[model samples]
Target: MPNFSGNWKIIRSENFEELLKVLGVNVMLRKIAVAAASKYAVEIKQEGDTFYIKVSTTVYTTEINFKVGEEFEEQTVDGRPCKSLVKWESENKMVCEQKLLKGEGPKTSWTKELTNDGELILTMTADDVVCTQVFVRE
Candidate 1:
């Protein structure tokens, strides 16, 4: 597996914040997230059995690190506590699942992939909504 090494800039985001309602983000906060600049920075790191992912923007920044298939606790940008787990689907593909632990909402699932051209493609699924966010190597 090729190490996914680099910070990435978000070039695309579709219905991501819109889908957040199902993922437990409050309506007002969801609006703020959507209004924030779409130019998000995402960083990923791997060491032994663990992977660390950090995402940032002018409005919010969050870091999540976990070992594949190991359960952990994570909090979202909007302060939702979630029980999270990650797993590798392929050499360049990964799956992260997060279930809300302190709110009334559906779970959010993520698929992270490093494309052949070095682009980072992240798909976030909450309930029936699927939001695709693409990032370019930076």
Candidate 2:
């Protein structure tokens, strides 16, 4: 399997504002989140079948740990509590699906791929809206 274990820094983003809106983030939080995207970093690690992921930005830091193909609870960065499932689609690609537990948010999916040039591309989709973020190893 392709190893995606490392610290990564965000370098680019597309349609992130639409993603925040689809996830039901309020105006104030969404504004802050859009701006904060410029200063984001992520750490990913794997030990056997479990993966640990942590996201950091000027506004907040959060982490999640889960085994591949297992369902677990997740609190998203925008503060939405949801059920999340993650799986490997290929050696270089991983996918995740999240369903909101209590409120009116669309189901969301994230696809992460490690490019040949060593960049990480993360795509988030919800309600037909898509956002993509690119990261480089730090």
Candidate 3:
């Protein structure tokens, strides 16, 4: 398998604020999210049958551990409880489908891809909205 284990920094985001809003995030948090100075980091680790993903900042953290094709109960960084199942879709791409359990909304899915140019790209979609984020190795 291609190695995707590394720490990454967000370099670009598209429609993130709207995505957050559609996901039930409050206006205050969305405003705070627009401040790039309050940045975040993402780390991915693979051990045995599980993949661990950590996304965090000075104020909050989101950690998820999963085995491909296995469903898990997870609470999102923003505190939304959801049922999630992640699976490898290709040699360099992983996809996760999530159903929100605590909030009323359509389901969501996300994908992580290792680009040929060495960028880690993530895209999430829900309720007809999409957010794209680009990350560079740290």
Candidate 4:
């Protein structure tokens, strides 16, 4: 497992268009999102049995702090309130379980992998899609 415990800057993003499509983002939003020269910065830290991850973009930023195994409520990407659980399956893998307010039941767990190539890969079952965002050292 690679150590992803430092500041990372976004270089390129792939499959985001498809993700936006699945998210039902409108054409106007897509246009703005695609054209926007936004950089994402992520900071990950670990302390004993707890971990902290902060994601920041030009438009929004969010921070998540959790223990190795715990559940918490969080806002979805669409800004909808939801209940979610995050667990560290391993040293290099994290899983998310979200229950949406729309009564979508509980969505399948999503997994994120931090690769040595400086890429963060997110896989979700809702659309059976995989998204990759390249990062560079800040």
Candidate with the greatest TM-score versus the true structure: 2
lDDT of 4 by residue, 47-130 (tens): 765768888878878897877567776766545677677777776777888787565532444666677676765554445655
How accurate locally is residue 75 in candidate 1, as Cα lDDT from 0 to 100? 74
Prediction 4 global C-alpha lDDT: 0.67
Residue-level lDDT of model 1, residues 1-138, one tens digit each, is 456767889888888776877666788888877767386898888786688888889867788778887999987434678888888898889888888887576657878898988889988877788889899978
| TM-score to native of every candidate shown | 0.84, 0.89, 0.87, 0.76
Work out how many backbone clashes candidate 2 has: 0
- Could you tell me the TM-score of candidate 3? 0.87
Query: Which structure among the candidates has the greatest lDDT?
Result: 2
TM-score of 4: 0.76
What tens digits encode model 3's per-residue C-alpha lDDT throughout 1-138? Answer: 547788999998888888778767898878787674238689999775588899887777778889988999986434678899988888789898888787576667889999999999999887698888899998
lDDT of each: 0.80, 0.86, 0.81, 0.67
- Model 2 accuracy (lDDT, Cα): 0.86
lDDT of 1: 0.80
Question: If the candidates were sorted by their lDDT against the true structure, best first, what order would they fall in?
Answer: 2, 3, 1, 4
Clashes of 3: 0
